Every structure is written in structure tokens, then in C-alpha cells.
Design an enzyme around this catalytic site. Sequence first.
Site, PDB file in Angstrom:
ATOM      1  N   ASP A 171      45.704  34.358  46.167  1.00 24.63           N
ATOM      2  CA  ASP A 171      46.231  35.497  45.450  1.00 24.63           C
ATOM      3  C   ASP A 171      45.197  36.415  44.768  1.00 24.63           C
ATOM      4  O   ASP A 171      45.494  37.577  44.455  1.00 24.63           O
ATOM      5  CB  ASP A 171      47.303  35.009  44.425  1.00 24.63           C
ATOM      6  CG  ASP A 171      48.591  34.470  45.121  1.00 24.63           C
ATOM      7  OD1 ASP A 171      49.050  35.082  46.122  1.00 24.63           O
ATOM      8  OD2 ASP A 171      49.133  33.456  44.667  1.00 24.63           O
TER       9      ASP A 171
ATOM     10  N   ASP B  19      34.663  33.203  40.288  1.00 26.61           N
ATOM     11  CA  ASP B  19      34.707  32.438  39.059  1.00 26.61           C
ATOM     12  C   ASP B  19      35.539  31.169  39.119  1.00 26.61           C
ATOM     13  O   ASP B  19      35.491  30.343  38.178  1.00 26.61           O
ATOM     14  CB  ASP B  19      35.000  33.309  37.810  1.00 26.61           C
ATOM     15  CG  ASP B  19      36.485  33.628  37.634  1.00 26.61           C
ATOM     16  OD1 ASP B  19      36.826  34.123  36.502  1.00 26.61           O
ATOM     17  OD2 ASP B  19      37.266  33.431  38.591  1.00 26.61           O
TER      18      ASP B  19
ATOM     19  N   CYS C 189      39.329  33.111  33.366  1.00 29.57           N
ATOM     20  CA  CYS C 189      40.125  34.284  33.767  1.00 29.57           C
ATOM     21  C   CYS C 189      40.790  34.992  32.608  1.00 29.57           C
ATOM     22  O   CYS C 189      41.260  36.132  32.770  1.00 29.57           O
ATOM     23  CB  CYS C 189      41.239  33.868  34.733  1.00 29.57           C
ATOM     24  SG  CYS C 189      40.688  33.021  36.213  1.00 29.57           S
TER      25      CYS C 189
HETATM   26  O1  LIG Z   1      47.701  34.631  40.913  1.00 30.37           O
HETATM   27  C1  LIG Z   1      46.396  35.254  40.882  1.00 30.37           C
HETATM   28  C2  LIG Z   1      46.397  36.421  39.869  1.00 30.37           C
HETATM   29  N1  LIG Z   1      46.839  35.839  38.574  1.00 30.37           N
HETATM   30  C3  LIG Z   1      45.673  35.114  37.958  1.00 30.37           C
HETATM   31  C4  LIG Z   1      44.528  36.013  37.465  1.00 30.37           C
HETATM   32  O2  LIG Z   1      43.634  36.284  38.557  1.00 30.37           O
HETATM   33  C5  LIG Z   1      47.264  36.967  37.740  1.00 30.37           C
HETATM   34  C6  LIG Z   1      48.611  37.552  38.185  1.00 30.37           C
HETATM   35  O3  LIG Z   1      49.561  36.552  38.581  1.00 30.37           O
HETATM   36  K   LIG Z   2      46.070  39.305  46.429  1.00 31.55           K
END
Ligand SMILES: OCCN(CCO)CCO
Ligand SMILES: [K+]
EC number: 3.5.3.12
Length: 369
Positions: free
Chosen positions: A213, A219, A359
Amino acid sequence: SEESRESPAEHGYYMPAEWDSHAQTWIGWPERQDNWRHNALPAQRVFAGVAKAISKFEPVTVCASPAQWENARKQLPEDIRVVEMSMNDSWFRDSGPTFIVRKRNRNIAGIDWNFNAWGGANDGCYNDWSHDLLVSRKILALERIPRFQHSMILEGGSIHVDGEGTCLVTEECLLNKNRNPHMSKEQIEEELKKYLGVQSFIWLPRGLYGDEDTNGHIDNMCCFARPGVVLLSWTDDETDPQYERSVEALSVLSNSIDARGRKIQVIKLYIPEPLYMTEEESSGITQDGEAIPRLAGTRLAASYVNFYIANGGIIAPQFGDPIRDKEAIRVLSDTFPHHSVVGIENAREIVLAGGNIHCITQQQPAEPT
Ligand SMILES: OCCN(CCO)CCO
Ligand SMILES: [K+]
Ligand SMILES: [Cl-]
Ligand SMILES: [Cl-]
Ligand SMILES: [Mg+2]
Ligand code: NA
Ligand code: NA
């Protein structure tokens, strides 16, 4: 939007390593029911724990939406500053500014990258990032710190630096057509040299298995521990799809040289035994047609590499694994002998929404005098 007329490097700025001194850490506050189970309450409590742990080392500001400001202010200790800020979600590593500093008018600035929710209208994680697009401007305006703007789409979680000229990245993320399909590898490198003050790159082909995703942010795969030394997400289990990624990254790293001409030493930081979202977890997340689904059975993108470095502190996830949690604390304590390592239990709650401690944080360097 458009790009600043002059680059950071033209003014002497560069991005310092995360282990250089900070003035403060910035963190958002989670809320959206289609990403955070149970009306985000369990995640809010883990974000507050991460913020509080960091506040023992350095100042923290948590930013919370208009609807959430009172809740965040109740859930955080009084020496954490809580400010109102609109956001579409709470991932300040990615939507927040990437700070830069210089030696030789201010000696700190922030970069406001373009953003598209990790892959835009086609491939992004949610459908509206218009508040997120203002988070970096608002943070820098708060602090009265100058801003450079880029038109390139970039997230802070996709780049890592050693502070000595090297940038560590993944091809899976920065070369994905869902980010900057108008730009070549070489053009992306050129922009990063101009904006981060770097001279050379180490390109791992892929990030962590399960991080499709974000498209494999660096990172959550590999980071610097100090110049010439990286921590790499690892498994010995050849049946895990992670294994081929770890072995390929180790092969690249063992054939890499950093911007000052050192070979890279790799410390393996073992991932937990695989974690999967449960039906009970998934059942607490709404489906409002605005975000990607969160399904039972999903392999969680869990890696102890997604820790944050603060002033004299390492803030590391704990995933409940009866050997890998304590191994990670030990490896990080040995690798950062001048830092205190603090583990955050129930880091799983952050990992259910696709990221972890690194994150959700964004360091503000101390301004050189
Ligand atoms: O699912 C991956 C993105 N997610 C984690 C931060 O990168 C934020 C939006 O759901
Ligand atoms: K994506
Ligand atoms: Cl502004
Ligand atoms: Cl601890
Ligand atoms: Mg931005
Ligand atoms: Na409070
Ligand atoms: Na299953």
C-alpha cells in the site's frame, strides 16, 4: 504546485541524519473510522504512548483535527503541546515537512513535497488528501520556519539519509508510475540531490513484504544506524515472501558504497513471526467507500526497523512476539549504545493501518547557530 526558484542546496542546506539533535518531534492524531478500528480509540491510546515516550527525550507537539482537539488534549500529558490542525489521516512522516539545516538567514528550513495519499486517484490509500496537502505549510508557519516547495510527489518515509551525502531508497516506491511517472530515475536523483543535499544513492529494489500500500517505503525495510551501517529487515524462513526480498536487499547492500566511499555493514533485524489482521480487528473498521479495505487475514507490514531516533532515545515497536521483541530491543541497544531503547507495546495497533512509529513521527532538527 510549482517548485521553489532556488533549491535547498543552492542556499547551503541539507537533510541531517535522524540521530542528529532535535528541537522537537511532530505527530498527528488518528481518527478516521475506515482506517482505525473502534472509532480509533485503541490507536489514539498507542499514539499517545508513543508521544509520551518521546517527550521524555525531547519536546513533542501533537496536531489534532478540530473535532479531536479536546480528546487529544485529555489523552496526552500536559507537557506535550496539542495544536489544532485539519488532516485527512495521521501519518506525519509522510505528509509532514522534511526539515533541512545549514551551517552557514535562518539555518533551518522545511521541504513541502507534493503528496497524493501513496498513489493518487488510481492507487492511493484514501480518496481525499486536500487537508494533508496543507499540513507541511501549517507546521512550518506555526514554527516560523522557511519553506521550500516541490512539485514532485514524495513522502518522508520513502527516503533515508546518513547526513554524509547518501540517500537510501526503494525502486518499488519512487519509480512507481503512481508517484512521478513523468520523471526518470535520474531526474528523481537530481531533485533529491538538490533538495536533500545528497550526492549518491543506494536503491533497494523492493521494500518490506506486506507494504504494497505504500509501495515498499524504505523506512519499513532498511535504515541507517550510523554512517556505513544499516539495519535490514530479516527472516531465515525461505517460505516467507519476505525472505527473497531480504536476500535481494542484502545482495545490493553488499555491493554498495556510500557517498563517502565506505562499504555498507548490514545488521539483520529479524521481523516478528508473521502477523495477520483478525476478523475481530477488521470488524471494527467501517467501509464508507473512501479508503482501501482492511481485511481479515492481511499480512501486517511489521518490522522493528520502523523505530524513531530521538535525543538520547530509540522508540521501537513491540509486536507481542515471544522472542523477536526482546531480540529487537537487544540489537537496537547494542547498535545505539548512547541511546536508551524504549519499546512500545501494542504497536500492532498502528500496523493495522499500514505503518508504525517511524511513520507517525517527523523530527524537527535543532537549528545550527
Ligand atoms: O496503508 C499504507 C498507508 N497507511 C500507512 C502510512 O504509510 C496510511 C493510510 O492508510
Ligand atoms: K499505494
Ligand atoms: Cl504558508
Ligand atoms: Cl521499555
Ligand atoms: Mg507536503
Ligand atoms: Na491531559
Ligand atoms: Na486466514
